[PDB]
Assembly symmetry: D3
Homo-oligomer: 167 residues x 6
């Protein structure tokens, strides 16, 4: 089952339940019916998840699916691992005509990112790398998405607080 | 960790709960009570599993252990992840008196194997490396294992059913 | 571990419930309110654990924390992997405030260590490589640790049945 | 490091000197003068090569660089190792004005691919992931690349010859 | 390296000829009488190099040895990999007998460090993680090292053209 | 080309030019016509080289092929890497009716094996693991071999000195 919480200070520090460790071509997903890790699909192209992709406990990103969070990690964690994350941005894209934003966060417990606190704290090539990833990783799956851009911490925190109360 | 079902439409597609990620030399089993991961043993020889090995939920085979399944995976998965596998063959092997059969399943969610529906679609070398592995991976342990051969998907599934029925 | 017999033989055949697989730089920890894997920190230096690091269920060690056990593995397992271990020694050190004793062990089901029963059977340098490890990993984090030395197997097996009963 | 020949019997089997081991995100090229490994660049997107990429010794193609070869390898090899590859197809792609074609070769010394003689033997998904990779792996860099398609082994080899003849 | 232009721009665009890929615990070295890769030693502690470690061809540094350069790479290369680097700093330390200065650099052809030119652009903790590294790796081998601190990019670029000419 | 030497003290310490790093399923081989690494074959079975397999510079194991040496290494080296090796045993087997012995050595520069100097210094499960490997790794290649056993250092040193003078 799951019943864990959104995290400590909330908009400030949040919990990140990881499903896909950086470097994976295999896209996993936490099962709601079981609570165990299940294989969603193997990316049709040689893309490797650029970050530790996961969700934030008990959040409701409109309808259904929890709010997804991308944690920058210098060494991938294992699926189903909880991370205390400091949001720093909001990746904004539209899939089937709808907003499909995601929280770009960073690890609290890794001094490397101690002074990282807002998109303008992340080299641009990286952001473009995460962006270029969602833009093409499902293309062979007959899906194309429209990318809008990013937003800083506040928007992130802003969306999180919401997604949570919406939950 | 067995409150889950044998999978989607049982015959044609089942769930494979992995225990051993491809390329591993540590042999992990799914603990009875706990459900958690258990270091079964460290193979006595420099072999690494050539597939993702695991079990089909809610199934019981001849010996008296879950029906084992082998999912051919390009990139290994983590012990305990669920996988929607499509059987394509049955591995017949006898471990020390026990009729220890295994299913050869492929990922439903990887196009690479889009046209791997039956044992006749698998490169004969791969099948060969698979039987050789079991044929010998225990030799040092003292257990001698005889290999019998292969059977296609239909067989695989016929056995899947029977295993499900034996859980009860 | 919420519930799990400490080990099937005691003294000897003990149950090691790994948290940090050898080779890892991410220091993981097990939470009791959840039972899920949780990222605790990221070693501030480029240090990688020299052994799988775990704990013995249903134990209690003087500081309140469980009983830490270092299993010596060739190929690292996965966090939450239950390993039937077998303590061949005890590593004495103090995180500066209450002694923090780790239990050096060897996995059964691996003929490789067939003849490993005391720290005397353990190559010296290795033993050292560990000593240095704790005597130096947190240092960077502005913290010190007093590493005395090692104690025998029976020694370890002593502090062990203590804690396994101390409940 | 090019005193070596195009390979055994040139058409049917060539040598492939690898530069990029499968699964790598760092792009390595074979330095002109030195011969030694050169970090060409770090791909701008989370792509990892899906094959062992390298060059056919003593060959020169249209653009003005060695004829490139792709060896499908289960377990990647080290940059600079030689491999006896068996072509089975030709990848047609145009990089910024240049007719940048590549050979699709398989290992002679891996039974797994025993029956991979032509492009029709390759799982269509794999071929698809291959073209998608080139089609986009440079997008961020500013270079836009158009993909043209595939041709079988005969084609591959016809081009191998021509490349050899252009070295001279 | 028997022969190879130190780098195409000097000051800046320098030629780094890696010996020990980041992540490695085997300390490799390049032999001049052969030019082949050679195992030099195995760090006595479970330390793994934090960066690809190399040297600048056709240089000479006060002790007779070449000029060491630490490139900061995301994915490690392979020994004998020529990387067009770019020194953003200088790491000052002394192996106890003659100062041993390393040259912290950043690879070009990796937009990620697009804006890395001085140690000020380098996350602090990281810089530290290195400092600790040398200030602690050989210790176990009954040896000490005096780690002062870091110096700027121009600082590094200075000691550099020294050695590149000192021949 | 190659022209390197057998090693330092000779029967005592020897050089090991590695072709196949521990963990490889891919069997490589140093090319005599080129001197570059070439792929011999990919093992027909999921065996992974148990050790760093290689050759000793300028040795003549009867006809042709250089004397092969197996170095025990806790972390694999890269192909074409030179290692100073301390012989400790002779693996004895017969392939096509002939002796096809190999030198089992150990790394000088890794304190872990400081006190390893003779087969009786290597856990037995390991020796049986190396042995079981050659016994079956070419079976699917229609070849079966006959395994005789091992011999200690002196035999090794004895065979090396010979193989060299024979060269």
């Amino acid at each position: 089952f799951h019943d864990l919480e959104p995290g400590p200070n909330v908009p400030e520090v949040v919990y990140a339940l990881i499903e896909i460790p950086k470097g994976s071509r295999n896209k996993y997903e936490l099962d709601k019916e079981t609570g165990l890790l299940k294989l969603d699909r193997v990316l049709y192209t040689p893309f490797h998840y650029p970050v530790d992709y996961g969700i934030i406990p008990r959040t409701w990103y409109e309808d259904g699916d929890p709010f997804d969070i991308m944690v920058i990690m210098r060494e991938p964690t294992y699926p189903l691992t909880i991370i205390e994350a400091r949001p720093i941005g909001l990746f904004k894209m539209i899939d089937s005509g709808d907003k499909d934003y995601k929280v770009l966060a960073v690890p609290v417990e890794d001094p490397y990112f101690k002074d990282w606190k807002d998109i303008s704290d992340v080299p641009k090539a990286f952001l473009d790398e995460i962006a270029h990833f969602f833009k093409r990783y499902k293309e062979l799956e007959g899906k194309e998405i429209i990318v809008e851009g990013w937003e800083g911490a506040e928007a992130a925190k802003r969306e999180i607080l919401r997604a949570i109360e919406m939950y």
